[PDB]
Amino acid sequence: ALVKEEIQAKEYLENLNKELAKRTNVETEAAWAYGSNITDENEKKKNEISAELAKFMKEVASDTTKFQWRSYQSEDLKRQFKALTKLGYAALPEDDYAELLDTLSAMESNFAKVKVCDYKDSTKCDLALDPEIEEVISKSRDHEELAYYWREFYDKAGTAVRSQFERYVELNTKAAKLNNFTSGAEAWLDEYEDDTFEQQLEDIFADIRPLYQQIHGYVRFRLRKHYGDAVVSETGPIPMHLLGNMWAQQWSEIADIVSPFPEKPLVDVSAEMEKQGYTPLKMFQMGDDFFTSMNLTKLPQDFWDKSIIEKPTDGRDLVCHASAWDFYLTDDVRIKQCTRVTQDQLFTVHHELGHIQYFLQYQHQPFVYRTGANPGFHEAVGDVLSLSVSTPKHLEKIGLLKDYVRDDEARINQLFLTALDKIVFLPFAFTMDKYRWSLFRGEVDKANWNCAFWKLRDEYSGIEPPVVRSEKDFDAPAKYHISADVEYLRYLVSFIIQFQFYKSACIKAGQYDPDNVELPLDNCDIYGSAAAGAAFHNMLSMGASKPWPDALEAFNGERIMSGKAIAEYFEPLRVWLEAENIKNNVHIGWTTSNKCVS
Ligand SMILES: *[C@@H]1O[C@H](CO)[C@@H](O[C@@H]2O[C@H](CO)[C@@H](O[C@@H]3O[C@H](CO[C@H]4O[C@H](CO)[C@@H](O)[C@H](O)[C@@H]4O)[C@@H](O)[C@H](O[C@H]4O[C@H](CO[C@@H]5O[C@H](CO)[C@@H](O)[C@H](O)[C@@H]5O)[C@@H](O)[C@H](O)[C@@H]4O)[C@@H]3O)[C@H](O)[C@H]2NC(C)=O)[C@H](O)[C@H]1NC(C)=O
Ligand SMILES: C[C@H](N[C@H](CCc1ccccc1)C(=O)O)C(=O)N1[C@H](C(=O)O)C[C@@H]2CCC[C@@H]21
Ligand SMILES: *[C@@H]1O[C@H](CO)[C@@H](O)[C@H](O)[C@H]1NC(C)=O
Ligand SMILES: *[C@@H]1O[C@H](CO)[C@@H](O)[C@H](O)[C@H]1NC(C)=O
Ligand SMILES: [Zn+2]
């Protein structure tokens, strides 16, 4: 009967979890070796271990049907068994799984090996995205130079893998249906355990959208004064190569030319970092210090011994795109980052260390629970710290910001600077998955795949390519996450919920009072707050043991994803910016782009 079986099932799960952790450790090591050192030998090794683990998962999924798990009394045991039914790609027949793995590594390695020629010297053709091309995109204000690097990169990282991407969509769809989801869109959405999740995001996005339109309008106005009306039109989408980022996902690199008050200070601490002799090691030690100051977990010795925190100086190929790794043992956690000494990189260091902290907080959990409450939670942790490290308050403490007077106009500059990252990112993040959902669901014919991409980038972000594109190009995979098959909705969710976490953490730290002008949300520093740390410990140690609303409740008593906190943060900017656009008769909104020929 069921009473004896449930007792046996508990013993089965305890053993199986340990076995899965150990088998996944082996797969992860292989994936790490390939990511740090791209070779045909390492690819073969990585993909063969994965096929072996997939085969074992099939046996596991099959074995769950032998247990009457849906009949059990324990919610915890049922939740664990349910986790074990979720095969994903491992549901594919042996040969199809092997083909998908070959397709995925072909795309990620193509991206990682992209090299372009120097604009000024066609002899020098060893310029990688990280750091060479990104340096030019972020620093150059020569629109024809920017356009050149845009075209070269997108042609190599995007168009070159069209056929591979098509096969990936086919196999992703096949895998989803084998798991009885309609498509890979629904498979991705299952991670959020909420049948109204899409609508919830539409609703939140609609509330923030008008603020984005105002920022867009003002930035376009300021770019016209810089580049002139031949380069930037008043009424059209912004030419994306002028926004200081290869994908126009963040605009903070052009802050010096679009800032509300150019005679008042704009925080940019890169020069001081360099002056004070900062290194990648110091940046990571500072990040570690922040976490420990909050009474959270110190980085283990394995992290320092095994991480790769600087780009290797031999001729080898690797994935430089920053990442954090869990090896599912004890204290074996690693970062791989091609760290540069800049302000934005300091934020990225904290982002990645947020992942590491999460890994450490839930490593005592059974294997199936050793992941985020939802994917957005994992992305939010580090960004919460980054919000406080970016404050004038904190940057002055660590001696990176000198002779700073925090008047109303400096405050507006800082809010605007933050918005150029945080608000600008929202429509970007939404479109990355909206696009892939539409392909996964079979809503766009293959003949229209590229213009379907640029249509969304137009509709939501109001940006366009610097040159005319067509269905002869394929631009989506020029973004890492698209080439590497990493779901993007996590970042949209993160950018919303991180303000929920930040606001609550700041109240707990005594750093925010809505009725005290001395304690504004935009100058909150949670450094050294054990009270904020405690809330994180309560939430992060849970892992995926409970549905995400219970994890949020453990942090601050709330159970709902809400746009209230992000709106509250930027409210002073909104009021000012609305008035400023009216003062300057700034055109808001945009005409449909002519940059993608059907
Ligand atoms: C995605 O959805 C799929 C459905 O679209 C689903 O596929 C179905 O899975 C079922 C297994 O859960 C499977 O059901 C079995 O069918 C066998 C015969 O099917 C054949 O004939 C049918 C023609 O009429 C065709 O439609 C099929 O294609 C096949 O040719 C049965 O022999 C089998 O039975 C046995 O198992 C049941 C289940 O027992 C359960 O557990 C305990 C036993 O330990 C019971 O006490 C309990 O009550 C419960 O019933 C026993 O009752 C029985 O005695 C037999 O031992 C079973 O019904 C079905 O064939 C399959 N396909 C289709 C088209 O329906 C996928 O599994 C889903 N995938 C995922 C990942 O979720
Ligand atoms: C740098 C970071 N990269 C990693 C990608 C994660 C990953 C890496 C490899 C395989 C699967 C997932 C991350 O930590 O999420 C990243 O791409 N982004 C996103 C991005 O740059 O697109 C925005 C997020 C806010 C700050 C940086 C974060
Ligand atoms: C990269 O891998 C090759 C074999 O594929 C190995 O011989 C070499 O040591 C690795 N290089 C580095 C720098 O680790
Ligand atoms: C630090 O954390 C421990 C347990 O994680 C807790 O017992 C202790 O009270 C914390 N320190 C402070 C000052 O709250
Ligand atoms: Zn992340």
From Swiss-Prot:
It is found in: Secreted, Extracellular space. The active site is at residues 352, 481. It comes from the Eukaryota. InterPro entries: Peptidase_M2 (IPR001548). Residues 3-591 form the Peptidase M2 domain. GO terms for biological process: metamorphosis; peptide hormone processing; proteolysis; response to symbiotic bacterium; sexual reproduction. Belongs to the peptidase M2 family. This is Angiotensin-converting enzyme. It comes from Drosophila melanogaster. The lineage of its organism: Eukaryota, Metazoa, Ecdysozoa, Arthropoda, Hexapoda. The gene is Ance.
